[PDB]
Design a protein around this ligand. Structure first.
Ligand SMILES: CC(=O)N[C@H]1[C@H]([C@H](O)[C@H](O)CO)O[C@@](OC[C@H]2O[C@@H](O)[C@H](O)[C@@H](O)[C@H]2O)(C(=O)O)C[C@@H]1O
Length: 659
């Protein structure tokens, strides 16, 4: 299959290029596929990569184009004036703008298929959207088409939507090419920046909440939320997936499911993006969400995650019950047997389930992965699948038998419907992991566990204290161990308001640490401890970040090499009052008095491009690795998008900009 027209290296500055002679009436069937490898010299304005139109007076709504906006949205229009049919199909955050101050080459494509009545758009190897439309128009359906142009749309004798950049290669086909062909044709260097991809070895179409960490041995490790029923926090099914690199981030392992329940199958789901439909959620599977990583002095690695029983949301969960009882001074996870009103049971030594009314063992036990046994044999429940049947969501028992689990909605014995924290440990730097341990009720018996601040933990250097950031909704909760992670305690710090205080730590000097965190007031706060986290100052705020009131998670790390003769920290955050956008990386130099000189910053892409949760690490060669949500993950317009969490790298010289 060969193009009706192929052109190369067309550099344009808003004026376009007429190719009417070279396309006129060549779209015989009316179907089309247009594949465009381009880079933009300026992202400003609405820009058309090509335009096929009726250019006559009064026919300004008779055209087809593919367009780009200054926020990375890719779309297409197909409009006919006299039928008054106006089709617009798009997806936000589909393309890249710039990277290290150079324009990024993207390859995008549109396919119009008359038999299916669908338009499909592709960017950098991903089919970003395919939509069936009742008012479908192919080229033959639009009346009096007479002008075909590169880099604009000719409307009433004037060039509209002028493209600024270079069309490195553009191919027009007069048929609808198949999906696999077009994915391949749009695959390029941008495609290789995705570690996790839709329907890879995780089975998930969607991801959020990346975390990077560099181990002592040189391995670069990642974890992430694999979110199956779109990108919703809740209700959903979420697993923690992981992937690692032993060549300084150049190549990564196929992702593994590292924390995952099996009450619901981990399957690729086409979550609707329409107004209304996009609010759909599943009934909820048992969930792990929001990971934190730290490597211990002895090289054992810990990973923490929040744990939610099936159907339980952060917002509706109980805040007044830890899910534990205290019996003879020991804390045991409690259970309610189906049909009881009270929690009459506890999981005690060797996972034996006791009846607390009689203080005797039952026939039941719970293994270290939370599965229930009766007389030494596993009880089972049937797994759920989710599907779409005529754009209708269905959940059903799918024929797979899995172990009954205390976190499942079908369990005979159930935990309190609240949030928990679990951790797992690895002795081989992430290749294999222990069974999970639920954190004891460190907030008290009558409070829920904290919520983790996604990213890393630290080991403070003078005491060896391990610190894990978390929050409650009104306090900071700094989880810590003074015995190399054998037992855990918490410092609870009341906050000026009800912040979603996702935090990360840095050490300024021995004993002196700061916790940087999200707030609800638009600013990034930092609290200071001069005794390795035992006591904390009142909040101070960064002067140079101004965000919306909901705020976003951040990443901050210590860096090992001197910059301008000073110890340095590296901060990643959005910085925009208009959304989760305008990602920046800031270098802060530690002054002799332990204040920070925020001396340099680098804008990650253009200012209106999306940038939400992020994670930094220092690579073994002292370059910087960044993985981030390259979209606005708060916006109701950018939910449920595929392949939007890339990994990129910077040398310090790439970052030392703007002063
Ligand atoms: C991709 C896209 O959004 N196309 C729109 C287009 C652009 O929004 C606009 O040209 C970019 O500046 O606008 C279209 O509408 C014209 C219409 O816009 C209203 O906001 C205004 O009230 C009207 O006077 C008139 O300008 C267009 O036809 O250009 C619609 C198109 O779908």
């Amino acid at each position: 299959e060969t193009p009706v027209l192929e052109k190369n290296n067309v550099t344009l500055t808003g004026g376009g290029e007429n190719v009417t002679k070279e396309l006129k009436d060549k779209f015989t069937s009316g179907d089309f596929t247009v594949v465009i490898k381009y880079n933009q010299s300026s992202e400003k304005g609405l820009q058309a990569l090509f335009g096929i139109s009726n250019s006559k007076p009064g026919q300004q709504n008779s055209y087809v184009d593919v367009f780009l906006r200054d926020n990375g949205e890719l779309g297409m229009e197909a409009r006919d004036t006299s039928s008054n049919k106006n089709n617009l199909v798009s997806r936000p955050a589909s393309v890249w703008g710039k990277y290290k101050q150079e324009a990024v080459t993207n390859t995008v494509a549109v396919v119009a298929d008359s038999v299916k009545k669908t338009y499909s758009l592709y960017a950098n190897g991903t089919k970003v959207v395919e939509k069936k439309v009742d008012n479908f128009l192919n080229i033959k359906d639009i009346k009096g088409i007479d002008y075909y142009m590169l880099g604009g749309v000719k409307r009433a004798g004037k060039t509209a939507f002028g493209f600024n950049g270079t069309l490195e290669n553009i191919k027009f086909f007069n048929s609808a090419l198949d999906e696999e062909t077009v994915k391949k044709m749009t695959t390029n260097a941008v495609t290789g920046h995705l570690i996790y991809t839709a329907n890879d070895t995780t089975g998930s179409n969607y991801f959020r909440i990346p975390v990077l960490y560099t181990f002592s041995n040189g391995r670069v490790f990642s974890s992430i939320d694999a979110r199956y029923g779109g990108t919703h926090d809740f209700l959903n099914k979420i697993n923690i997936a992981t992937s690692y690199s032993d060549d300084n981030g150049k190549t990564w392992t196929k992702p593994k499911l590292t924390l995952a329940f099996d009450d619901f199958a981990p399957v690729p789901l086409e979550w609707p993006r329409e107004v209304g439909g996009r609010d759909l959620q599943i009934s909820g599977g048992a969930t792990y969400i929001d990971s934190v990583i730290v490597e211990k002095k002895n090289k054992q690695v810990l990973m923490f995650a929040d744990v939610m029983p099936a159907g339980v949301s952060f917002r509706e969960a109980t805040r007044k019950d830890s899910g534990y009882k205290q019996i003879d001074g020991n804390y045991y996870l409690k259970l309610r047997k189906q049909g009881d009103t009270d929690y009459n049971y506890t999981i005690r030594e060797n996972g034996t389930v006791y009846d607390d009314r009689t203080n005797r063992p039952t026939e039941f036990s719970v293994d270290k992965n939370f599965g229930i046994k009766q007389n030494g044999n596993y009880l089972t429940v049937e797994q759920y699948s989710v599907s779409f049947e005529n754009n209708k969501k269905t959940e059903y028992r799918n024929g797979t038998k899995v172990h009954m689990n205390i976190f499942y909605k079908d369990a005979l014995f159930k935990v309190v419907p609240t949030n928990y924290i679990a951790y797992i440990s690895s002795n081989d730097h992430g290749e294999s992991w222990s069974a999970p341990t639920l954190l004891p009720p460190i907030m008290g018996l009558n409070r829920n566990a904290p919520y983790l601040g996604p990213g890393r933990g630290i080991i403070e250097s003078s005491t060896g204290r391990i610190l894990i950031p978390s929050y409650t909704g009104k306090e900071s909760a700094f989880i810590y161990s003074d015995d190399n992670g054998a037992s855990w305690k918490v410092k609870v710090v009341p906050l000026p308001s009800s912040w979603s205080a996702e935090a990360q730590f840095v050490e300024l000097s021995p004993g002196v640490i700061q916790a940087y965190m999200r707030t609800n007031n638009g600013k990034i706060a930092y609290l200071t401890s001069k005794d390795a986290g035992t006591t904390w100052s009142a909040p101070e705020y960064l002067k140079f970040v101004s965000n919306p009131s909901y705020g976003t998670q951040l990443s901050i790390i210590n860096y090992s090499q001197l910059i301008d003769g000073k110890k340095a920290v590296i901060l990643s955050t959005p910085n925009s009052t208009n959304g989760r956008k305008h990602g920046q990386i800031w270098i802060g130099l530690i002054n002799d008095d332990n204040t920070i000189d925020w001396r340099y910053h680098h804008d990650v892409d253009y200012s209106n491009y999306g940038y939400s949760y992020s994670t930094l690490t220092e690579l073994p060669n002292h370059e910087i690795g960044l993985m981030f949500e390259k979209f606005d993950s708060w916006s109701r317009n950018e939910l449920h998008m595929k392949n939007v969490v890339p990994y990129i790298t910077f040398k310090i010289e790439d970052l030392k900009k703007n002063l």
